[PDB]
Amino acid sequence: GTSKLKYVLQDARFFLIKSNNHENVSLAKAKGVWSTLPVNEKKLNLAFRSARSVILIFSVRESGKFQGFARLSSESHHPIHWVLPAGMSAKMLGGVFKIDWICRRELPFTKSAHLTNPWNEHKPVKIGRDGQEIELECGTQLCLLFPPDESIDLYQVIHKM
Numbered sequence: 450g451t452s453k454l455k456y457v458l459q460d461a462r463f464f465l466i467k468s469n470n471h472e473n474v475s476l477a478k479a480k481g482v483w484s485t486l487p488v489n490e491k492k493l494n495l496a497f498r499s500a501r502s503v504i505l506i507f508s509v510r511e512s513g514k515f516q517g518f519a520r521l522s523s524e525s526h527h528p529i530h531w532v533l534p535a536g537m538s539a540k541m542l543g544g545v546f547k548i549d550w551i552c553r554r555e556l557p558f559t560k561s562a563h564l565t566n567p568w569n570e571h572k573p574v575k576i577g578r579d580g581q582e583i584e585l586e587c588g589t590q591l592c593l594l595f596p597p598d599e600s601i602d603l604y605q606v607i608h609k610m
Protein backbone atom coordinates (compact mmCIF):
# COMPACT_ATOMS: atom_id res chain seq x y z
CA GLY A 450 0.00 0.00 0.00
CA THR A 451 0.83 3.70 0.12
CA SER A 452 -0.23 4.70 3.65
CA LYS A 453 3.13 4.43 5.44
CA LEU A 454 4.72 6.34 2.55
CA LYS A 455 2.12 9.10 2.85
CA TYR A 456 2.80 9.23 6.59
CA VAL A 457 6.55 9.67 6.04
CA LEU A 458 5.84 12.44 3.50
CA GLN A 459 3.42 14.31 5.77
CA ASP A 460 4.66 17.87 6.23
CA ALA A 461 7.94 16.91 4.54
CA ARG A 462 10.20 19.18 2.56
CA PHE A 463 11.53 18.02 -0.80
CA PHE A 464 14.67 18.85 -2.79
CA LEU A 465 15.74 18.00 -6.32
CA ILE A 466 19.26 16.57 -6.01
CA LYS A 467 21.40 16.07 -9.12
CA SER A 468 24.16 13.53 -9.58
CA ASN A 469 27.02 13.88 -12.03
CA ASN A 470 26.88 10.14 -12.80
CA HIS A 471 25.15 6.87 -11.99
CA GLU A 472 28.08 5.58 -9.92
CA ASN A 473 27.50 8.11 -7.16
CA VAL A 474 23.82 7.19 -6.95
CA SER A 475 24.84 3.52 -6.79
CA LEU A 476 27.23 4.26 -3.93
CA ALA A 477 24.53 6.29 -2.17
CA LYS A 478 22.01 3.46 -2.57
CA ALA A 479 24.51 0.93 -1.17
CA LYS A 480 25.90 2.99 1.73
CA GLY A 481 23.04 5.30 2.70
CA VAL A 482 25.11 8.50 2.36
CA TRP A 483 25.33 11.62 0.21
CA SER A 484 27.52 14.70 -0.01
CA THR A 485 27.21 18.07 -1.71
CA LEU A 486 28.96 21.37 -2.23
CA PRO A 487 28.83 23.67 0.82
CA VAL A 488 26.01 25.83 -0.62
CA ASN A 489 23.54 22.96 -0.67
CA GLU A 490 24.95 21.52 2.55
CA LYS A 491 23.86 24.66 4.40
CA LYS A 492 20.42 24.57 2.78
CA LEU A 493 19.83 20.92 3.64
CA ASN A 494 21.08 21.32 7.22
CA LEU A 495 18.62 24.18 7.76
CA ALA A 496 15.86 22.02 6.27
CA PHE A 497 16.73 18.99 8.40
CA ARG A 498 16.12 21.05 11.56
CA SER A 499 12.89 22.54 10.18
CA ALA A 500 10.82 19.54 9.16
CA ARG A 501 9.70 16.11 10.25
CA SER A 502 11.13 14.67 7.00
CA VAL A 503 13.49 16.04 4.37
CA ILE A 504 13.23 14.12 1.10
CA LEU A 505 15.97 14.07 -1.55
CA ILE A 506 14.73 13.16 -5.04
CA PHE A 507 17.69 12.13 -7.19
CA SER A 508 18.28 12.69 -10.90
CA VAL A 509 21.45 11.76 -12.77
CA ARG A 510 22.24 14.59 -15.18
CA GLU A 511 21.16 13.92 -18.78
CA SER A 512 19.47 10.65 -17.79
CA GLY A 513 15.90 11.87 -18.38
CA LYS A 514 14.80 10.13 -15.17
CA PHE A 515 14.74 10.24 -11.40
CA GLN A 516 16.58 7.30 -9.82
CA GLY A 517 14.67 7.24 -6.51
CA PHE A 518 14.23 9.19 -3.30
CA ALA A 519 15.49 9.07 0.27
CA ARG A 520 14.95 10.77 3.62
CA LEU A 521 17.72 12.58 5.47
CA SER A 522 18.47 10.85 8.75
CA SER A 523 21.18 13.29 9.87
CA GLU A 524 22.68 16.70 9.40
CA SER A 525 25.99 16.70 7.56
CA HIS A 526 29.05 15.39 9.42
CA HIS A 527 32.78 15.31 8.70
CA PRO A 528 36.76 9.02 2.78
CA ILE A 529 33.98 7.71 0.52
CA HIS A 530 35.19 6.73 -2.95
CA TRP A 531 32.92 9.09 -4.87
CA VAL A 532 33.55 9.50 -8.60
CA LEU A 533 34.12 13.24 -8.88
CA PRO A 534 34.28 15.46 -11.98
CA ALA A 535 37.73 16.23 -13.36
CA GLY A 536 39.38 19.04 -11.42
CA MET A 537 37.19 18.62 -8.31
CA SER A 538 38.86 17.43 -5.12
CA ALA A 539 37.15 15.64 -2.25
CA LYS A 540 38.12 18.64 -0.09
CA MET A 541 35.60 20.76 -2.04
CA LEU A 542 32.69 18.74 -0.65
CA GLY A 543 30.86 19.55 2.54
CA GLY A 544 30.12 16.88 5.11
CA VAL A 545 28.31 13.59 4.61
CA PHE A 546 24.56 13.24 5.13
CA LYS A 547 23.14 9.91 6.21
CA ILE A 548 20.03 8.95 4.22
CA ASP A 549 17.39 6.21 4.37
CA TRP A 550 16.15 5.14 0.97
CA ILE A 551 12.38 5.22 0.51
CA CYS A 552 12.35 4.14 -3.12
CA ARG A 553 15.24 2.80 -5.22
CA ARG A 554 13.10 2.51 -8.38
CA GLU A 555 13.36 4.93 -11.29
CA LEU A 556 10.72 7.26 -12.74
CA PRO A 557 11.11 8.74 -16.25
CA PHE A 558 10.52 12.47 -16.64
CA THR A 559 7.78 11.70 -19.17
CA LYS A 560 5.64 10.44 -16.29
CA SER A 561 5.91 13.68 -14.27
CA ALA A 562 5.02 16.06 -17.11
CA HIS A 563 1.76 16.99 -15.38
CA LEU A 564 3.48 18.24 -12.19
CA THR A 565 4.71 21.82 -11.83
CA ASN A 566 6.88 23.24 -9.06
CA PRO A 567 5.67 26.57 -7.58
CA TRP A 568 9.16 27.29 -6.23
CA ASN A 569 10.59 27.20 -9.76
CA GLU A 570 8.04 29.38 -11.60
CA HIS A 571 5.64 26.43 -12.02
CA LYS A 572 8.02 24.85 -14.52
CA PRO A 573 7.75 21.04 -14.81
CA VAL A 574 9.16 19.47 -11.64
CA LYS A 575 11.97 17.77 -13.57
CA ILE A 576 13.42 21.26 -14.17
CA GLY A 577 15.59 22.82 -11.50
CA ARG A 578 19.13 23.51 -10.42
CA ASP A 579 20.73 21.06 -8.02
CA GLY A 580 19.19 21.73 -4.63
CA GLN A 581 15.96 23.30 -5.92
CA GLU A 582 13.23 22.95 -3.31
CA ILE A 583 10.00 21.33 -4.49
CA GLU A 584 6.80 22.61 -2.86
CA LEU A 585 4.96 20.14 -0.56
CA GLU A 586 2.03 19.21 -2.81
CA CYS A 587 4.10 18.82 -5.97
CA GLY A 588 6.78 16.87 -4.11
CA THR A 589 4.24 14.54 -2.52
CA GLN A 590 2.59 13.81 -5.85
CA LEU A 591 5.97 13.26 -7.49
CA CYS A 592 7.00 10.72 -4.86
CA LEU A 593 3.65 8.94 -5.20
CA LEU A 594 4.24 8.49 -8.95
CA PHE A 595 7.27 6.27 -8.41
CA PRO A 596 6.69 2.53 -8.69
CA PRO A 597 6.25 1.03 -5.22
CA ASP A 598 9.51 -0.38 -3.85
CA GLU A 599 8.39 -3.59 -2.14
CA SER A 600 11.92 -4.26 -0.89
CA ILE A 601 11.72 -1.37 1.62
CA ASP A 602 9.88 -1.42 4.95
CA LEU A 603 9.07 2.11 6.18
CA TYR A 604 8.44 0.94 9.77
CA GLN A 605 12.04 1.81 10.73
CA VAL A 606 11.93 5.27 9.11
CA ILE A 607 8.69 6.23 10.87
CA HIS A 608 10.41 5.56 14.19
CA LYS A 609 13.18 8.05 13.34
CA MET A 610 10.62 10.84 12.94
Ligand SMILES: O=C1CC(CN(Cc2ccccc2)C2CC2)=NC(=O)N1
Binds near residue numbers: 467468483579
Ligand atom coordinates in the same frame (compact mmCIF):
# COMPACT_ATOMS: atom_id res chain seq x y z
O1 LIG B 1 25.52 17.53 -8.87
C1 LIG B 1 25.71 17.01 -7.74
C2 LIG B 1 26.56 15.76 -7.75
C3 LIG B 1 26.82 15.10 -6.52
C4 LIG B 1 27.65 13.88 -6.34
N1 LIG B 1 28.77 14.07 -5.36
C5 LIG B 1 29.98 14.75 -5.95
C6 LIG B 1 29.68 16.18 -6.45
C7 LIG B 1 29.15 17.14 -5.55
C8 LIG B 1 28.84 18.46 -5.99
C9 LIG B 1 29.05 18.83 -7.33
C10 LIG B 1 29.58 17.88 -8.25
C11 LIG B 1 29.89 16.56 -7.81
C12 LIG B 1 29.06 12.89 -4.56
C13 LIG B 1 27.99 12.51 -3.44
C14 LIG B 1 29.35 13.18 -3.02
N2 LIG B 1 26.28 15.67 -5.39
C15 LIG B 1 25.47 16.85 -5.49
O2 LIG B 1 25.04 17.24 -4.38
N3 LIG B 1 25.20 17.49 -6.63
